[PDB]
Amino acid sequence: LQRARTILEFEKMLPEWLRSRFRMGELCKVADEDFRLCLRINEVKWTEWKTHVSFLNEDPGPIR
Amino acid sequence: AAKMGKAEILKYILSREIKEKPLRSLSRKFTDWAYGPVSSSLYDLTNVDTTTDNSVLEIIVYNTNIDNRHEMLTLEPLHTLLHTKWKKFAKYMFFLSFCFYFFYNITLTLVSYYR
Amino acid sequence: AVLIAAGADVNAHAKGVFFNPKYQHEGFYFGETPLALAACTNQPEIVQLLMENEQTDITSQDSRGNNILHALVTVAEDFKTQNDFVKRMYDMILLRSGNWELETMRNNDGLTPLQLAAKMGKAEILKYILSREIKEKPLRSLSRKFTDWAYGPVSSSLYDLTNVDTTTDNSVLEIIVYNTNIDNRHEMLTLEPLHTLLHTKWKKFAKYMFFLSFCFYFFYNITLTLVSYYRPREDEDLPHPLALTHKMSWLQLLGRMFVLIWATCISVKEGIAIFLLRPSDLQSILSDAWFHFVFFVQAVLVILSVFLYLFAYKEYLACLVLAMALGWANMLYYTRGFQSMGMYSVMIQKVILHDVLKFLFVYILFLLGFGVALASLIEKCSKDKKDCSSYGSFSDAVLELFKLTIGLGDLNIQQNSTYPILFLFLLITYVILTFVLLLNMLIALMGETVENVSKESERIWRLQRARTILEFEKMLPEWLRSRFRMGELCKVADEDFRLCLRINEVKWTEWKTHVSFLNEDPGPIR
Amino acid sequence: IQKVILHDVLKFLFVYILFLLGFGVALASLIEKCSKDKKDCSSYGSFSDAVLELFKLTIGLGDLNIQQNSTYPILFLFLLITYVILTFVLLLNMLIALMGETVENVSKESERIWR
Ligand SMILES: CCCCCCCC/C=C/CCCCCCCC(=O)O[C@@H](COC(=O)CCCCCCCCCCCCCCC)COP(=O)([O-])OCC[N+](C)(C)C
Ligand SMILES: CCCCCCCC/C=C/CCCCCCCC(=O)O[C@@H](COC(=O)CCCCCCCCCCCCCCC)COP(=O)([O-])OCC[N+](C)(C)C
Ligand SMILES: CCCCCCCC/C=C/CCCCCCCC(=O)O[C@@H](COC(=O)CCCCCCCCCCCCCCC)COP(=O)([O-])OCC[N+](C)(C)C
Ligand SMILES: CCCCCCCC/C=C/CCCCCCCC(=O)O[C@@H](COC(=O)CCCCCCCCCCCCCCC)COP(=O)([O-])OCC[N+](C)(C)C
Ligand SMILES: CCCCCCCC/C=C/CCCCCCCC(=O)O[C@@H](COC(=O)CCCCCCCCCCCCCCC)COP(=O)([O-])OCC[N+](C)(C)C
Ligand SMILES: CCCCCCCC/C=C\CCCCCCCC(=O)O[C@@H](COC(=O)CCCCCCCCCCCCCCC)COP(=O)([O-])OCC[N+](C)(C)C
Ligand SMILES: CCCCCCCC/C=C\CCCCCCCC(=O)O[C@@H](COC(=O)CCCCCCCCCCCCCCC)COP(=O)([O-])OCC[N+](C)(C)C
Ligand SMILES: CCCCCCCC/C=C\CCCCCCCC(=O)O[C@@H](COC(=O)CCCCCCCCCCCCCCC)COP(=O)([O-])OCC[N+](C)(C)C
Ligand SMILES: CCCCCCCC/C=C\CCCCCCCC(=O)O[C@@H](COC(=O)CCCCCCCCCCCCCCC)COP(=O)([O-])OCC[N+](C)(C)C
Ligand SMILES: CCCCCCCC/C=C\CCCCCCCC(=O)O[C@@H](COC(=O)CCCCCCCCCCCCCCC)COP(=O)([O-])OCC[N+](C)(C)C
Ligand SMILES: CCCCCCCC/C=C\CCCCCCCC(=O)O[C@@H](COC(=O)CCCCCCCCCCCCCCC)COP(=O)([O-])OCC[N+](C)(C)C
Ligand SMILES: CCCCCCCC/C=C\CCCCCCCC(=O)O[C@@H](COC(=O)CCCCCCCCCCCCCCC)COP(=O)([O-])OCC[N+](C)(C)C
């Protein structure tokens, strides 16, 4: 909690053309005509098995 | 929910996923790809990142009325978001603040001892 | 079942980048075959449906050289994050094959599935393999545990020592001890064919070679102390005893030539062991090879004290005194021979890393911070013409604050200060920050470190003694090594001899009728 | 009292005598002959005097004088500060922490041993 205050103080200090360069996430087409600028987190789960419905990409690799 | 400090409702909203097909636009968590145990996912950063004003990350950090403000930064779209800010631009601005202030106390000690 | 009966290939490999990644968060490595996918994803019905088909090649090897049994060892995890099915899939496939062909293949690194489980550090699979027992009569040759005789509660058993003892190269006992990448290397030496095997090596030849190393090194520090304390204290009496400076037929000349012979035999021997073991981790040298550097430094300073004496530089006392002080602090290595004094040296090594180094960083900040602010306040000492104050310089005000912490000397506040009240305010604030706060918080923080590592200090000690035993075993020649061999040949099955080890035990809670033994007569033979 | 002497005091007194006699020779072997001042130039002249001056520094009696008759005045300070860290900071504070374990175990049994 003490280090999180120090990070947000330095982010209000730097100018605008630095702030656009240091931006997180990328635009992802989520649904029909919707773009929401999401963040990506990977994980591994072993205990619960199921058949996979409701995904976005069929090809599971990293694109390019 | 961030201003009053409600932990269990804020955990539900920030990672909400609807599997049922006609109502999938209401989610904030989306499975990008999955193959066996390994899977990937996307977390929506629309009104939680600090790009706008009165963001959810800003309300939790600068809040003095609540007491569990340190248990609310372990939530999964907020823990990774503070780690990425430190790795790109905040661990270098913090090191430059240490060198300008350590050089400041040397040049104040030496001009007061070799007076 | 529809696709296999229609004529699909059941041997196709997936050789892609996604199916064989470079980082573990980008893909999923499973063994590249459709037999290995159905077993690594907990599907017992499709595995049984694939092995009955006569086209399924069950001994295939993928691009890494792995087979079906190497792939199950790679994707195994603990009990907490994965239930048990890797251990149950390892048993189903082996009992269906029915021979030793899968257990003895070698991949491109040159490792069997038994050796690979020790290299990567998989605890639950290695416990299953080293004590595996099949009661069913036609498949009893696949076991590594055999019941020799049993009568009531008392029974005996044999553990196979084929590829786990150190008779061959890259043994399972050698991989566990010399492994630095894993972290649970001290929980893997409590397994039942490995715990008894390290106890037998200590009882026959390792507790006597360890005692002879203590007597040759304790006699070495006596004959270095006495030749450096009873030195001739005259520059006109120039010849030192070492290096044989003057041939005078001096009585007790064997004492100061024993130093030169034994100091080079350490610096050559310890130079090799640093050359072979090449680490990059800072954590590795403070946990495995600390006592190889400090025996090498102590032997260099004795040799370097000889060349600077024959060149007559009057610097040799600064290298002999650093050899006596370092030499008697190295005697704390020989405490691992005892359980009581061995666990006590583990707790010293944890307190210095976790509690002392944090204390010594904050204390030097306060001692040098208040040392300038008291030395910059004292006026020039010429009005009393001699010795008006003890805080005249920075190098004197630091010394007077070091003596106030340990409690020596006297406290005089009538200095030559121009501000006598401000001098008391900075001196009392130093006493509160160090005598009250820091030196009492150090005792409270050591109460946490002791309370955590006391549940682990025994198993860290047995890992340290297991390294010492395997170093003495590589040193003795071949005709000693055949005499000190463990176990005996036991006819296990039809034309099979495996050189097993015997362990007795008593079990009361589970009763059964005894089938599948080796000897009918339960006594010790002869 | 009978449990602390067996488990904690005898282990402390074995490591402490190793350091007190180990650094006692290395400080007594560094002091030059005391004839140039003709009387009482140093207190570390012999092995039996350098041991006594290190015993008095642990319990906290007397005074600390570093202007001895040493030929190497910086090496004399390096071996004297290293003795203070190993005994005053490390060993005498680890003894109090290890007695906290022995008391916490035998206090559940000290009544039945008494009867
Ligand atoms: C004795 C005097 C000479 C010492 C050698 C030379 C000194 C340099 C030191 C070198 C060794 C440093 C530690 C070695 C191993 C690293 C990890 C570790 O265990 O450290 C631990 C604490 O350690 C600290 O917090 C040290 C911080 C202060 C360092 C400077 C003070 C030294 C005293 C000299 C005065 C000022 C010196 C001025 C320079 C600034 C990390 O905490 P942990 O989480 O509990 O450990 C878990 C292990 N893990 C992190 C790997 C997971
Ligand atoms: C386990 C421990 C291992 C490591 C311990 C190793 C060191 C431990 C021990 C250290 C003892 C050091 C004191 C003696 C040094 C010799 C004198 C000297 O060089 O001072 C000179 C410069 O000094 C100045 O003129 C002013 C000082 C400015 C810098 C100090 C600021 C403190 C910041 C600190 C915060 C950063 C550190 C944070 C923590 C890292 C002046 O000398 P003098 O006063 O003119 O003396 C003349 C003597 N005479 C009068 C008789 C002729
Ligand atoms: C006070 C001064 C005079 C003392 C008498 C003469 C001295 C000789 C000593 C004799 C008595 C020894 C112990 C008596 C009972 C044995 C078991 C025991 O409890 O010891 C315990 C610790 O004990 C140690 O670790 C001692 C190790 C250092 C001994 C030398 C230092 C003595 C100080 C003199 C300076 C150097 C002397 C130079 C000689 C080298 C064993 O640890 P434990 O597991 O917690 O105990 C469980 C009991 N059990 C093991 C049976 C299961
Ligand atoms: C609870 C405790 C019970 C047990 C405690 C019992 C003992 C505790 C107390 C002990 C006090 C001992 C000091 C006084 C002894 C008398 C002097 C003497 O004999 O020294 C002689 C030999 O000494 C030498 O010449 C060099 C020493 C070599 C051996 C020491 C190496 C240290 C290794 C140690 C590591 C191994 C041990 C590890 C741990 C066991 C020389 O004497 P001197 O210097 O010429 O003196 C002249 C005096 N005069 C100048 C005034 C005339
Ligand atoms: C509770 C306390 C604990 C903390 C203590 C911390 C230490 C604090 C120390 C406080 C007192 C030291 C300063 C006093 C000044 C003396 C005067 C002097 O000669 O200055 C000298 C200082 O030279 C040095 O720097 C000292 C050398 C040792 C440095 C620290 C030891 C390293 C420990 C690592 C071992 C780790 C062991 C591993 C264990 C894990 C320089 O000489 P000068 O500049 O020319 O001065 C002129 C004087 N004259 C005219 C007479 C020549
Ligand atoms: C890749 C990303 C890195 C780029 C990002 C940097 C771009 C930024 C551009 C502009 C930012 C605005 C600058 C404000 C200036 C005010 C000064 C001041 O008061 O102290 C400030 C200095 O701490 C800093 O702000 C350091 C950041 C860089 C300073 C300016 C660049 C000079 C570089 C020169 C090159 C030198 C050599 C270079 C060697 C190669 C902050 O003080 P504080 O400590 O925060 O306050 C006290 C703490 N408290 C909050 C608890 C009270
Ligand atoms: C029943 C079973 C017993 C038989 C087995 C013995 C046969 C063995 C035959 C040959 C082994 C090879 C000898 C190597 C010599 C090198 C010397 C050296 O450097 O130090 C070595 C001495 O430690 C030993 O190796 C002791 C073993 C016996 C030494 C030789 C026999 C002399 C006996 C004379 C009779 C005397 C009087 C006899 C009284 C009756 C090892 O040094 P270290 O301490 O290991 O290294 C430092 C620790 N470190 C690893 C952390 C860095
Ligand atoms: C190269 C310089 C070394 C000298 C120290 C310099 C101080 C600064 C440097 C490094 C900082 C010291 C931190 C120690 C980190 C390891 C802890 C440890 O070893 O614990 C040990 C306790 O024995 C001791 O180490 C306590 C005694 C302190 C060192 C002796 C000082 C000698 C006098 C100084 C004058 C001579 C000057 C010499 C030339 C400068 C036992 O722990 P362990 O459980 O056995 O762990 C080892 C694991 N292993 C067995 C598998 C290997
Ligand atoms: C002593 C202190 C005095 C002061 C010192 C000052 C410095 C002090 C520094 C550190 C203090 C620590 C002291 C160092 C002790 C090291 C020795 C050791 O490890 O003992 C061990 C063995 O050792 C024996 O007891 C062997 C038997 C002795 C007779 C050997 C005859 C010669 C070999 C014949 C040559 C053949 C032919 C030769 C030609 C080739 C103890 O073993 P154990 O615990 O009883 O075993 C129980 C096993 N258990 C643990 C599983 C339950
Ligand atoms: C009054 C006793 C004083 C010491 C006797 C000294 C002379 C004796 C001469 C011959 C007797 C040989 C048989 C003794 C075997 C055990 C000794 C013992 O009980 O010490 C105990 C404490 O001691 C230590 O751990 C500190 C090390 C120094 C003292 C031990 C020396 C014995 C080594 C023998 C050869 C070196 C000969 C050196 C020549 C000078 C040992 O602890 P432990 O109980 O074994 O812990 C493991 C056992 N456990 C699993 C059951 C827990
Ligand atoms: C957030 C907004 C902030 C805005 C304002 C920021 C600016 C800051 C403003 C003012 C700064 C403070 C005063 C500095 C200037 C005067 C210094 C001075 O004269 O020394 C005085 C002492 O000095 C002290 O009393 C110690 C200073 C610390 C303050 C004590 C509070 C701690 C409470 C702890 C409770 C204990 C309290 C009592 C402790 C003593 C007196 O010294 P003297 O020697 O007698 O005078 C010389 C005359 N003679 C030579 C003839 C004798
Ligand atoms: C793995 C591969 C290894 C290979 C290499 C192995 C070989 C080893 C190589 C070299 C060994 C070290 C040097 C010995 C030879 C010179 C001795 C000497 O001159 O004394 C020097 C001090 O001596 C020291 O500084 C203390 C020695 C310990 C090293 C400090 C590191 C601890 C870090 C703790 C941080 C604090 C560091 C600062 C602590 C002071 C200076 O003494 P002097 O009195 O000023 O000189 C006389 C002049 N006068 C009389 C006019 C004054």
UniProtKB/Swiss-Prot annotation, chain C:
Keywords: ANK repeat, Calcium, Calcium channel, Calcium transport, Cell membrane, Cytoplasm, Ion channel, Ion transport, Lysosome, Membrane, Metal-binding, Repeat, Sodium, Transmembrane, Transmembrane helix, Transport. Residues 278-288, 336-338, 456-526 are cytoplasmic. Expressed in keratinocytes and hair follicles. It is found in: Cell membrane; Cytoplasm; Lysosome. It catalyses: Ca(2+)(in) = Ca(2+)(out); Mg(2+)(in) = Mg(2+)(out); Na(+)(in) = Na(+)(out); K(+)(in) = K(+)(out). The chain crosses the membrane at residues 200-229, 249-277, 289-309, 315-335, 339-377, 419-455. Residues 230-248, 310-314, 378-389, 416-418 are extracellular. Signal peptide: none annotated. ANK repeats lie at residues 30-60, 67-99, 109-131, 167-189. Na(+) binds at residue 407. GO terms for molecular function: calcium channel activity; identical protein binding; metal ion binding; monoatomic cation channel activity; monoatomic ion channel activity; sodium channel activity. Its main location: membrane. It is a multi-pass membrane protein. Residues 390-415 dip into the membrane without crossing it. GO terms for biological process: negative regulation of hair cycle; positive regulation of calcium ion import; response to temperature stimulus. One of its GO terms (cellular component) is receptor complex. Activated by cannabinoid that binds to the vanilloid binding pocket. Diphenylboronic anhydride induces pore dilation and enhances cation permeability by promoting the conversion to a homopentamer. Non-selective calcium permeant cation channel. It is activated by innocuous (warm) temperatures and shows an increased response at noxious temperatures greater than 39 degrees Celsius. Activation exhibits an outward rectification. The channel pore can dilate to provide permeability to larger cations. May associate with TRPV1 and may modulate its activity. Is a negative regulator of hair growth and cycling: TRPV3-coupled signaling suppresses keratinocyte proliferation in hair follicles and induces apoptosis and premature hair follicle regression (catagen). Homotetramer. May convert from a homotetramer to a homopentamer to allow pore dilation. Interacts with TRPV1; may form a heteromeric channel with TRPV1. Interacts with SNX11; this interaction promotes TRPV3 trafficking from the cell membrane to lysosome for degradation. Belongs to the transient receptor (TC 1.A.4) family. TrpV subfamily. TRPV3 sub-subfamily. This is Transient receptor potential cation channel subfamily V member 3. It comes from Mus musculus (Mouse). The lineage of its organism: Eukaryota, Metazoa, Chordata, Craniata, Vertebrata. The gene is Trpv3.
From Swiss-Prot, chain D:
It is found in: Cell membrane; Cytoplasm; Lysosome. The chain crosses the membrane at residues 1-30, 72-108. Residues 31-42, 69-71 are extracellular. Na(+) binds at residue 60. It comes from the Eukaryota. Residues 43-68 dip into the membrane without crossing it. Expressed in keratinocytes and hair follicles. Homotetramer. May convert from a homotetramer to a homopentamer to allow pore dilation. Interacts with TRPV1; may form a heteromeric channel with TRPV1. Interacts with SNX11; this interaction promotes TRPV3 trafficking from the cell membrane to lysosome for degradation. Belongs to the transient receptor (TC 1.A.4) family. TrpV subfamily. TRPV3 sub-subfamily. Non-selective calcium permeant cation channel. It is activated by innocuous (warm) temperatures and shows an increased response at noxious temperatures greater than 39 degrees Celsius. Activation exhibits an outward rectification. The channel pore can dilate to provide permeability to larger cations. May associate with TRPV1 and may modulate its activity. Is a negative regulator of hair growth and cycling: TRPV3-coupled signaling suppresses keratinocyte proliferation in hair follicles and induces apoptosis and premature hair follicle regression (catagen). This is Transient receptor potential cation channel subfamily V member 3. The lineage of its organism: Eukaryota, Metazoa, Chordata, Craniata, Vertebrata.
